Amino acid sequence: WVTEACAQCPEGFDQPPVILFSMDGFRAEYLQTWSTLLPNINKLKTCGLHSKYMRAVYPTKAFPNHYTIVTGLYPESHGIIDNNMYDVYLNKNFSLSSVEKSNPAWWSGQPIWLTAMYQGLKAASYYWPGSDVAVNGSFPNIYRNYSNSVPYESRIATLLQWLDLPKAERPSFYTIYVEEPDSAGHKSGPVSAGVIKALQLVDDAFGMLMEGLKQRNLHNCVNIIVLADHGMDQTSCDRVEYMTDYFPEINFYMYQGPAPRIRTRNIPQDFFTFNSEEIVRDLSCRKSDQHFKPYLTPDLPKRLHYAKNVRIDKVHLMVDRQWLAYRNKGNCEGGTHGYNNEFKSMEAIFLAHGPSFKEKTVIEPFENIEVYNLLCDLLHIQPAPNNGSHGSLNHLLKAPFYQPSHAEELSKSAGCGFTTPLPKDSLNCSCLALQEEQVNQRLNLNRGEVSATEKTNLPFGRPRVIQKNKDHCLLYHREYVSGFGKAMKMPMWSSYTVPKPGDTSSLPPTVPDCLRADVRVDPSESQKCSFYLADQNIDHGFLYPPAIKGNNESQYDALITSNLVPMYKEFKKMWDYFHKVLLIKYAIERNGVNVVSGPIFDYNYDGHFDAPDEITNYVAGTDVPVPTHYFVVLTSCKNKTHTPDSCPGWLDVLPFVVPHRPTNVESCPENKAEDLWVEERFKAHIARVRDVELLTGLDFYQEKTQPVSEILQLKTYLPTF
Ligand SMILES: CC(=O)N[C@H]1[C@@H](OP(=O)(O)OP(=O)(O)OC[C@H]2O[C@@H](n3ccc(=O)[nH]c3=O)[C@H](O)[C@@H]2O)O[C@H](CO)[C@@H](O)[C@@H]1O
Ligand SMILES: *[C@@H]1O[C@H](CO)[C@@H](O[C@@H]2O[C@H](CO)[C@@H](O)[C@H](O)[C@H]2NC(C)=O)[C@H](O)[C@H]1NC(C)=O
Ligand SMILES: *[C@@H]1O[C@H](CO)[C@@H](O[C@@H]2O[C@H](CO)[C@@H](O)[C@H](O)[C@H]2NC(C)=O)[C@H](O)[C@H]1NC(C)=O
Ligand SMILES: *[C@@H]1O[C@H](CO)[C@@H](O[C@@H]2O[C@H](CO)[C@@H](O)[C@H](O)[C@H]2NC(C)=O)[C@H](O)[C@H]1NC(C)=O
Ligand SMILES: *[C@@H]1O[C@H](CO)[C@@H](O[C@@H]2O[C@H](CO)[C@@H](O)[C@H](O)[C@H]2NC(C)=O)[C@H](O)[C@H]1NC(C)=O
Ligand SMILES: *[C@@H]1O[C@H](CO)[C@@H](O)[C@H](O)[C@H]1NC(C)=O
Ligand SMILES: [Ca+2]
Ligand SMILES: [Zn+2]
Ligand SMILES: [Zn+2]
């Protein structure tokens, strides 16, 4: 097989069997550098399909990741948030060394073997976390109780024996797990002779499987996926942070290593009463060269989706590349994993071979949460509710099983039409510059003016409202278009295409002390300038920056009540710096940039837009809700020769989900100019368009002339730097 050229199901095989092969700790880099040393995996890389890398879930550990691959769920939803965890309600400790690993109470969701079994198919497993557990009261048709020393040849032979079974007994889905190159990675690090030997050993295991399949004439019949749970990075005992250096006495329990959690020792009693906010405060900006950052789980970057679970302790530590965090100075040599999934070293491999996959294809990176829907498509079965975007992986398949469709809008735009240029209520707003209010006629756009602003500022169409009974209206202006939320008295979204900046030297500033009522929106559905007088902590901010487009006359279209959003004074410093300096820099690099911004409400930190009853903070003595986050989605043309409003091909996206916090403690900006921490803070809160979509109840790019499957690739894309 290994010498045979790049190449078909035999009698009794109506549907192609699926084999999911996991090579633990096989980082993406190992394939990029050492593939030519691995002849069997290199043939699979040459002939089959493979991604540049597959993104794992945080923490980049075995059990949360392996269970994510087979469920399509984030650890917070499937329950396995770590290898070591504590549940207060169950009052039990989970570990790989305890019998609690086999307790079905910890395992939520529906793994692929169960999905296949519930839909008339048989499933076998030669090791996989959860497969030796009675998840939802059931085990796979054939399974093996985990035994790490069983030779690879014996595991392969048993799997080939399962494929030799008669059609009635023979399973359609198979899982197989191998401990290497992870074990070698821990011993001597990712760049060692030990990992080379381990990589050659896993190549022999894959070689035995392919040769075994060739013997049965199944090598071009079986749809095989070879992947990893996470990557590997080098550790050092000179790269360890100690909690003794920050606390005089440690009375708390700590889950040590690359993804730390802090909780009380007195469990279950003090679990909820434990001052989690005190610990994060006592660890924030303590040392200038601090190699970790403390966080309360709702404050963690939203793209991680690591907060909505009792097992996820409120205190979390984000550890820097190649560093570790422990209780005391009392392992640390070689290598480990568990770090941020965005780190290059934490990236996993993904290779596919078989009749359902595209031959000799290199695909762009994607997330392991998408594998579940792909496995369902290969097995011709319906997926259970998960976090993958069904259809985003169709570009991997020769003939896709599922055809995705645009999300249907649940609420239509109504009202806010121009009637009179004279406001019925001033809303306690003042603009001494005026005077006449003839600038209100600039808000009265004709049919051709609406079409001109729709073509420029909504080039991919308006974001659709995927919310029931959401009373809203669209507001058209020469420089921007917005979707105003009537009940919350603020826009849900604001869209505008910034053209390529010329001068940049002396740009006009924002017109000060000028704010007035919007004649198009009802006074009862509008924000008042007097609302921001009573509250001292929160002030008003502009969603669309008035001075970014046009002249002085253009600024008046944005200096209205409908462009106001509740903003913390410290947050406004980041927001105004981004729109004045960073946004112009991005518009130069991208040859113009389309911007869609708006508020996010996620008080229950579940990654979904809040229902009105879920909002727990408002502008003092008003019903105006305070956003938990602010989104900024930047869209430009992939081909930089075109502007965002005249882009025929693919698009390039850069979304941000920035926490709306009263302090900038996360950036540690004491005695530091904004050019040293604002960009770093925005970059730390980069997310996918899909993340923005879930947090807002909006759907983007529905008017882009491209198939839904290609648009889903753009929506699941995570920009990296
Ligand atoms: C074995 C090992 O080096 N584990 C390290 C890893 O944990 P982690 O839990 O992520 O495990 P690894 O990815 O390193 O290796 C797989 C582990 O899962 C077990 N397994 C695998 C498959 C299966 O079906 N069933 C099963 O029980 C293996 O016995 C092994 O212990 O990162 C931690 C980071 O803080 C380290 O402290 C741990 O020492
Ligand atoms: C746990 O197993 C039960 C039983 O197999 C599943 O319940 C079935 O769900 C389907 C789809 O909703 C229904 O058509 C069946 O009538 C249900 N059967 C019973 C006995 O209730 C359940 O969905 C499984 N749960 C998970 C998370 O996989
Ligand atoms: C995996 O190990 C468990 C034991 O930990 C086995 O479960 C036992 O199976 C017998 C029947 O063969 C039952 O009478 C026992 O009550 C079970 N014990 C427990 C604790 O569940 C299981 O059969 C093993 N699986 C394989 C494939 O060997
Ligand atoms: C789960 O493991 C932890 C850590 O080993 C145990 O924590 C101890 O809990 C008691 C109170 O029940 C405290 O007084 C001790 O100080 C804790 N020890 C440590 C090392 O933190 C906990 O008891 C275990 N729970 C179960 C149910 O096994
Ligand atoms: C990831 O997918 C899961 C499953 O669809 C989502 O969790 C469900 O959320 C609803 C409430 O919106 C609950 O009624 C279900 O019980 C949850 N199911 C499970 C298995 O937990 C989850 O919200 C999704 N996550 C994101 C961020 O979209
Ligand atoms: C970019 O667009 C121009 C036309 O404006 C075209 O000639 C060029 O080939 C495109 N570049 C790529 C990489 O497709
Ligand atoms: Ca929510
Ligand atoms: Zn692993
Ligand atoms: Zn490991």
Author numbering: 140 to 146, 152 to 474, 477 to 581, 586 to 871
The authors write:
All NPPs share a conserved zinc-binding catalytic domain (phosphodiesterase or PDE domain). NPPs hydrolyze pyrophosphate or phosphodiester bonds. In this extensive study, we determined the crystal structure of NPP3 from Rattus norvegicus in complex with a phosphate ion and various nucleotide ligands allowing us to characterize the substrate recognition of nucleotide triphosphates, dinucleotides and nucleotide sugars by NPP3. Similar to NPP1 and NPP2, the structure of NPP3 consists of two major domains, which interact via a large interface of 1279 Å2.
A complex structure of NPP3 with UDPGlcNAc showed that the recognition of the uracil group is similar to that of adenine. The 6-membered ring is stacked by F207 and Y290. Additionally the uracil base is oriented via two water mediated hydrogen bonds. D276 interacts with the N3 atom of the substrate via one water molecule and the backbone NH of W272 interacts with the C4 carbonyl group via another water molecule. Similar to the situation of the NPP3xAp4A co-crystal structure, the orientation of the α- and β-phosphate groups does not correspond to a catalytically productive binding mode for an inline phosphoryl transfer. The N-acetylglucosamine group is well defined in the electron density map and its atomic B-factors are by ~10 Å2 higher than those of the ribose group, indicating a slightly increased flexibility. The acetylated sugar forms no direct polar interactions with the protein but is packed against the T482 and H330 side chains. S237 is interacting by a water-mediated hydrogen bond with a hydroxyl group of the sugar. K205 forms van-der-Waals contacts to the sugar. The participation of T482, S237 and K205 in substrate binding could be verified by mutation experiments.
